[PDB]
DNA sequence: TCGGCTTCGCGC
DNA sequence: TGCGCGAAGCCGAT
């Protein structure tokens, strides 16, 4: 649908229809941001061919409550950011509050819209909102992959098991989709609050808090500035003064050599591509390019690969089958120790390297990554079984972390305790032949005591 | 029908 | 600290 630096491969029409009159509509949803925006270009670009205007509409959804302060706050303030970049360019957000299977159908028809745009998320409950609105609208519909480098749709037809199959196919198609990106053209035409949807929505969390003994709150909302303006930051001081010893340091949590780009990256605050365009045109270590690279672009869209293709993806059912019957075989294997939610939650356990992980992910909201390798595989060796081994898991991250509900967590999940994208290993107690972590195989790694202290 | 796929453990 | 190095499945160029 016009333009020149716009690949149609990034497109795909949902339903069919004839264009309205009206403006175009872009249903934003998981790419929260202005510049380096597929889904906003492109919307744009229809608005512009049909002389229409482009309007973008955000619909908050009631999952907000399973999801605590630190979310909400991280994603209201870059979206109030957001709203007055978008106006500086004479583009309107409207801001809706309900099921978007109703609201968003309720929005078209009410403003005359004449086509529908949204982004592309591989998660369960958007394919839900998506069909409602299908069947509740007369317009044509299309979805932009704004996340993904190369559309997720494109680079693979199937589930990948591994990351060395799904490899060479992501880097075969760098060279048609990693693109620079066009500026964003505002528009030609010009034509709820939200101080006060984050006033309702934290005193509906209020009480759902993480506290310490003296009613001391847990959560340290000062280690990440949210906004579209400081994921930048965050990325120009990773490429100068991080990316340089990324790839020695990157499984040593007691130093900060991270990129710190997930918390910007699941919200959509800053484009992956974008990343990418910077990390590929930086003079740093060969090593170290190529172990980042290998980070956001295959394992991070391997997850939606993973999700896309996978309708369970957070149940015992996506695991590989080498993995059920192993995990099957030993489920009545004696557990050293058995910890429930609310002991795994307080990190109440013997293990103190364990306990300072969690201490970690509910200070900061952002627990270190190779620690949540150990965090998630001790959650399946004191269990009572693999289902309730998922499901603690994947409860304590959607809470707590930053990036949480996200395909990138599913994925990570259940590559350690299902194996996915994994092999087998050695044969062992209650994990079976699931790659197993220790404490003494960490001590060797990295200075764990400093890891312990640092988090009590 | 082999090949070498990490974010492993553990011994120089 | 780098470097080996067993121990286990299923993919993919054949
Ligand atoms: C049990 C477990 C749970 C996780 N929970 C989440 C989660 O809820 N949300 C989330 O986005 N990621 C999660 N991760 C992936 C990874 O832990 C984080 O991406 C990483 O820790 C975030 O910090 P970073 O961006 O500074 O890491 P970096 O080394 O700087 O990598 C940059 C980006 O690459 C991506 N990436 C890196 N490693 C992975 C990976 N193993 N899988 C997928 N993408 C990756 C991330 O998007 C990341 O932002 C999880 C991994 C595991 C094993």
């Not at 870059?78 to 299977?101: A, H, M, N, T, Y």
């Not at 529908?116 to 958007?126: A, E, H, M």
């Not at 994947?394 to 999940?413: F, H, K, S, V």
């Amino acid at each position: 649908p016009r333009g020149s630096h716009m690949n149609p491969k990034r497109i795909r029409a949902l339903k069919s229809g004839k264009q309205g009159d009206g403006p175009v509509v872009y249903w934003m949803s998981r790419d929260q941001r202005a510049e380096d925006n597929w889904a906003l270009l492109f919307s744009r670009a229809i608005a512009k061919e049909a002389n229409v205007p482009v309007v973008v509409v955000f619909c908050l959804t009631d999952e907000f409550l399973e999801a605590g302060i630190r979310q909400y706050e991280f994603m209201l303030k870059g979206l109030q950011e957001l709203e007055v970049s978008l106006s500086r360019k004479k583009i309107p957000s409207f801001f809706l509050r309900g099921d978007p299977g109703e609201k968003i159908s309720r929005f078209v028809k009410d403003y005359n819209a004449g086509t529908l745009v949204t982004d592309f998320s591989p998660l369960r409950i958007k394919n839900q909102w998506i069909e409602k609105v299908i069947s509740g609208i007369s317009i044509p519909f299309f979805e932009v992959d704004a996340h993904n480098v190369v559309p997720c749709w494109e680079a693979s037809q199937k589930h990948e098991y591994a990351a060395h199959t799904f490899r060479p196919k992501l880097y075969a198609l760098l060279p048609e989709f990693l693109e620079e990106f066009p500026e964003l053209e505002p528009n030609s035409v010009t034509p709820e609050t939200l101080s006060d949807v984050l006033e309702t929505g934290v005193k509906a969390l209020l009480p759902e808090r993480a506290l310490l003994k003296n009613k001391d709150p847990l959560f340290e909302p000062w280690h990440f500035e949210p906004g579209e303006k400081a994921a930048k930051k965050v990325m120009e001081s990773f490429i100068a003064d991080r990316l340089d010893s990324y790839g020695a340091l990157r499984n040593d949590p007691t130093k900060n050599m991270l990129s710190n780009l997930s918390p910007y990256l699941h919200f959509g605050q800053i484009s992956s591509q974008r990343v990418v365009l910077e990390v590929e045109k930086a003079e740093s270590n060969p090593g170290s390019k190529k172990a980042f690279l290998d980070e956001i672009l295959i394992w991070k869209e391997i997850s939606d690969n993973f999700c896309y293709y996978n309708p369970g993806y957070d149940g015992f059912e996506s695991f590989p089958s080498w993995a059920k019957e192993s995990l099957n075989a030993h489920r009545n294997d004696v557990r050293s120790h058995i910890y429930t939610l609310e002991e795994f939650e307080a990190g109440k356990t013997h293990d103190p390297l364990w306990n300072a992980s969690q201490m970690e992910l509910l200070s900061t909201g952002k627990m270190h990554g190779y620690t949540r390798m150990y965090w998630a595989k001790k959650i399946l060796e004191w269990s009572e079984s693999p289902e309730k081994a998922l499901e603690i898991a994947i409860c304590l991250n959607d809470r707590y972390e930053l990036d949480g509900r996200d395909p990138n967590g599913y994925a990570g999940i259940a590559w350690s305790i299902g194996g996915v994208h994994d092999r087998a290993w050695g044969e062992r107690e209650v994990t079976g032949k699931i790659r197993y972590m220790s404490y003494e195989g960490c001590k060797r790694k990295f200075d764990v005591k400093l890891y312990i202290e640092k988090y009590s």
